[PDB]
Design a protein around this ligand. Structure first.
Ligand SMILES: *O[C@H](C(=O)O)[C@@H](O)c1ccc(F)cc1
Lengths: 525, 525, 525
């Protein structure tokens, strides 16, 4: 069971809860801290003193003073009037991540919510009650979270088979009585970054796995075209250019290609080249390349930079998950804190950066595909990997286009964290648009799986056409077999879409990262 | 019935076929021209002479010479190997538009396809057989069109209830025998801009209707806040700044607000202001605004610029629809033309421009919403249009956010027509990415309907709160009633998402443009 | 003196050398290590062994083997043939930063360059000989660096009074005999990321000062409008939301406003509002805002996020500065390393992230200007800060425009790190475009100084119009005085451009940061 204590939750744990449906538990210690905060807070609210969103109107209308006799109505009107999300609904796993993020925030203890709220959110996750959350509305996450809050009071909708179903009916069925929103509970539930933080957690965790699966297919490809191992030597990174991500990619590449009979060492290349040179010629041509193109040599640098970005984002998300992103906040023995911890700028920035890094990861993958399909670059392989008669057959020629087109499409996705537009009578004059940033990243992530899908298919085909399977390392043979388990070698031309979608789906669920886990003793970073 | 002659097809007709399921007919004259082209062409191919994609490999592999004995296989292998589209499938109406565009292209007579191909495409449209076309793959439209071509030879998939169904089964059922691809027919079916041109036609036609529905709600709003009519006077446009689009918007605005008892003439404003001024004061304050903010005065200029862009795009699309966007091409008494009329640059540019214009249309609408919800700008209306007790109730405060957020999101959509990436061994070193451009435009179009939805709801609410219904013009009363038919006045706060989605859907099907048609004698440009 | 040892150079140290003309010194240990590497390397090159760029052609032409007898010409043709930079020339400080970065790289000892190369570079820096480097041409930094290398062999141009003068006469004009490039020296001088890393260091270092100067005027503004101190309370950050940047900004804000008689504590605002509410009624209006708008409240969250991005970039840059970003590389007892440490992806990403972070910093600054100029938003200030009769005078109304316009302009700047385009026969099939990223960030940084200048002038004017000078904290008074030393109070309308440029220049110089350090006991993070 995952412990939601608002203190030690990790991105990986969030994914277990969201994707693996792992059980959630709010420890007794967190419940005690919440109960104490609530009790003291109630005493303050009971005195009818000014507290944002508790005894005042919302946003710009904070100038309106509301009596404590309107407690439940104030909180209820907020949730209803703000459930104005539009567009597609988040998938079940995305919605679960968002709920889990909100639960952890409140579990931290500074939101002054009744323990029952924590218990109910925990119950929805544990019993599989998934809110229907529209993806659009947050300025960075009122709208999305208001739809979640609605399901707690028996309103709004819950997701069932990808379809929204009236919450009232679902609760009546599952035998659950809706809650009533007391002081600050409506606001606490919707005043945070849980939308972008929950979705961002899924994206970043998956992005790291995508970085690994890119390294996996890259290694197979390098072996297929017999590239040099020189670029991955530890000295060039650990010593010469110690960027953390760069060090990790190189280490993974070395581990992945360990045991290969196809890769060539620099010592062997220069020797083969020295013999091919004759001695009375000052300048002479050679068909031997002492070094390969950037797409097969600058992998540690590029994928490493992507990793560095992903590491930074995961770090920010971990901090955010275990933060009290709510307002106002309760701190014992202190005035009620009135700030802006609901502002998602830190995460909006983080996700816009992930979008950029992942776009480049796809740019690299796409150029690697170009490399093996172009006879002028493939190094001995037939044009477009045609096994039979080229021309009559196009092989993988048409399969390159969707990959190329996706690189262009990802490049049309611009940063959202800088696109703030003032609203609410200028009260919200600077916002983060962080959920848009997170959805942009999810999109590139999804597009990259299609790009990698074509690369995995091209790599396996290259192995088949060159008859180099027996020369592959243990990891490469495993990668090759994983692909071939889904899609057969390309003999004569054939409809490609189903083949590409099948491998794309495998990538999305981390099947190749699994193959290596299961088939080799390799532990990827 | 719509006449598909490759000569006079209009964007409106395309939409009738796609959306209204209007019958298609290829006139006898077009059939005769096709039959003649095919017969002469066959005689040429029969001689086994070099003809791109007929007796040669494809793209970069044009260096491969293929004997006429491989006729059917060559064309078949192309269609199969290039059916590599990925992502979501186009909706039924979008797919129909694409098919219709391809049919019109071939109907022009320079593609040298057998009349049967025209007849079959026409049959699929007339019998409701809709190809399952993945949205991603085109570099600008091989992949998408290859999936369409597949359905003609009993391969690929057809769309049924939003689900892809094996074409073979559908044809066996409907009692139809798949065709065989003869010389050049596989290539002719997929070598064009029909994907971006077909989808672009739907978008542009709808965009013009969106421009009209923006003018409709703008007029209602202007009447509700009693704005000045001065900005719309014909002299300021027809004479002073004759941009075509600007002239049309002003004319529509004048027609829409004709008969209003709420709008004020400049003569009345200056007089009311002159009386409010006293005479011994050189500088004095007044609560009277002789002119209103840009969002209620610069409508002809902004919406007019949007119209100009839409007019240009529709013109380009009309030309493209009735062009032979295929290669190579047959011209009697001439060598076979080997060019690049498959290159979608003209349309890629057009659609990127539509994306930009529509984004601004939404920017304007969103600021008009801000105008009526902000008590400092609304001109007498209650804050956020709250009918009861503000603070306790937020009214439309939360509904503004999805509109604001969509403006930011549309701004994250960048031009695709400039993002060419070389592929196919550098043979396709400069592409247009036009289908991405068209899908970008469709997205902004769709987002704008949600923005306008909030504006229509805010406008009607403003009419209710100010009690100005009886002062509304005939068109305004009609617009108001149209909205109220779907959604009730906002008394106490309530869940808003369903209300917003309902009006957004009405906008997408042109319900407000219809209300004016049906209820007034106004004929909008 | 600044020690360029390839191990401990900092971003600050780079700026001292570049901006303050600080003397550079390559430690004897570095020279010794270089010497050692050079001796061993020379022994290998003498064997006519295959080494990239030493005994082979460059880039794609690596298939060409070049005999050691062509030692000097090979290196020379390279530098000449690649000196193809275009566009404007870098400023003297920028050029110096680039040279310093390259020198530090070679000082690491793995480039196998003769010590004289290190010495001559250090001499150029110490003697004020600045290379004329055009800004465009790097794919991420061959062209920029080739222009630098040219000056070492008496070719290309040197920068004098902003104009390029032939290096030949400049060297003669000061008794320096040009050098002759030997094995690997030409390549080592131009094969790295020193262009983007040198410029990036300057930008990031100045960006941190900009964040501080943003916090400085923001604090002044908050005091001028009597804002609440609640948002900056440590507990809200150090405890509730532990983001490093957020914690730093909050700490800085508390220190900047310490001792203010104008700011209000939450407790006082709360009591003040309590006193204003009547009993009985459960909903009543008030003119008191318990909380201020976001632009005055989520400073820690927004600027903190900017800071986190800047800290990450500085970290990347420090690592890069002290790395062997060159190829091939020498490691004693190992084969010559043939990798891609010249690939600027880590820096390209970092600078693209800085561009985004700084854009939002300006967004916030501009909305703060809007707050103070708008009578409906500013607390106790006349419209547009007009001292006399408004209407007759516009005050700062016209000055808001350039700030607003710059936010829009910065938003048109897109990421460059993802815009790779393949070149050099596809050898450079995946590049970083990092120098473009670095120049993008520089542009936003520069634009922000103008936006901020308007904010500084507006803040000072607000102090004068409200007569709140005596209530200002020590830091606020110092800021006010610094502004007033440059520009006087705005009485009647006047030409504004010179005043704005004056304050903008002061900002670029870090004058306001210096005012706080020279007049107060504050130490800003
Ligand atoms: O990135 C190249 C390398 O060192 O591998 C660089 O030296 C280079 C210089 C000049 C060229 F024309 C191509 C590459």
């Amino acid at each position: 069971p995952v412990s939601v204590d608002g203190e030690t939750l990790t991105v990986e744990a969030v994914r277990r809860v969201a994707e693996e449906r792992a059980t959630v538990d709010v420890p007794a210690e967190s419940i005690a801290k919440a109960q104490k905060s609530r009790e003291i807070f109630e005493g303050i609210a009971e005195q009818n003193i000014p507290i944002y969103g508790v005894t005042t109107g919302y946003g710009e209308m904070i100038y309106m003073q509301v009596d404590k006799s309107k407690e439940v109505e104030l909180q209820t009107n907020l949730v209803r009037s703000h459930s104005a999300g539009v567009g597609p609904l988040f998938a079940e796993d995305e919605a679960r991540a968002i709920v889990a993020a909100r639960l952890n925030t409140l579990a931290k203890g500074h939101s002054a919510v009744r323990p029952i709220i924590l218990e109910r959110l925990a119950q929805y996750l544990n019993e599989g009650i998934t809110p229907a959350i529209p993806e659009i509305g947050s300025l960075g996450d009122l709208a999305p979270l208001s739809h979640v809050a609605s399901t707690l009071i028996g309103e709004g909708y819950v997701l069932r088979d990808g379809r929204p179903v009236e919450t009232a009916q679902v609760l009546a069925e599952r035998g659950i009585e809706p809650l009533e929103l007391r002081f600050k509970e409506g606001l606490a539930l919707i005043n945070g970054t849980s939308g972008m933080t929950g979705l961002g957690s899924l994206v970043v965790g998956r992005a790291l796995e995508q970085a690994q699966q890119a390294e996996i297919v890259t290694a197979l490809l390098i072996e297929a075209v017999r590239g040099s191992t020189s670029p991955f030597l530890a000295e060039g990174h650990d010593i010469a250019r110690p960027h953390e991500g760069q060090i990790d990619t190189a280490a993974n590449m070395r581990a992945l290609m360990r045991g290969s009979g196809l890769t060539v060492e620099h010592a062997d290349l220069r020797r083969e080249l020295q013999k091919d040179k004759e001695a009375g010629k000052d300048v002479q041509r050679s068909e031997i390349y002492l070094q390969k193109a950037y797409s097969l040599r600058a992998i540690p640098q590029v994928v490493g930079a992507v990793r560095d970005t992903l590491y930074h984002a995961r770090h920010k998300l971990r901090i955010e998950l275990n933060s009290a992103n709510d307002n106002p906040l309760f701190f014992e023995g202190k005035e009620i804190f009135h700030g802006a911890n609901f502002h998602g700028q830190p995460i909006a920035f983080a996700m816009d950066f992930v979008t950029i890094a992942l776009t480049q990861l796809g740019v690299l993958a796409e150029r690697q595909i170009n490399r093996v399909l172009n006879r002028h670059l493939s190094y001995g392989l037939p044009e477009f990997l045609v096994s039979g008669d080229p021309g009559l057959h196009s092989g993988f020629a048409g399969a390159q286009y969707p990959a190329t087109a996706l690189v262009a499409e990802n490049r049309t996705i611009g940063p959202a964290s800088t696109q703030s537009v003032p609203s609410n009578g200028d009260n919200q004059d600077v916002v983060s648009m962080g959920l848009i940033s997170a959805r942009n990243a999810r999109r590139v992530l999804s597009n990259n799986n299609k790009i990698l899908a074509v690369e995995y298919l091209a790599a396996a085909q290259a192995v088949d056409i060159s008859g180099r399977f027996d020369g592959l390392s243990p990891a490469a043979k495993a990668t090759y077999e994983a692909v071939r388990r889904l899609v057969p070698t390309l003999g004569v031309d054939r409809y490609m879409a189903d083949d590409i979608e099948l491998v794309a789906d495998a990538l999305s669920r981390g099947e190749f990262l699994r193959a290596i886990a299961r088939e080799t003793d390799i532990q990827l970073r």
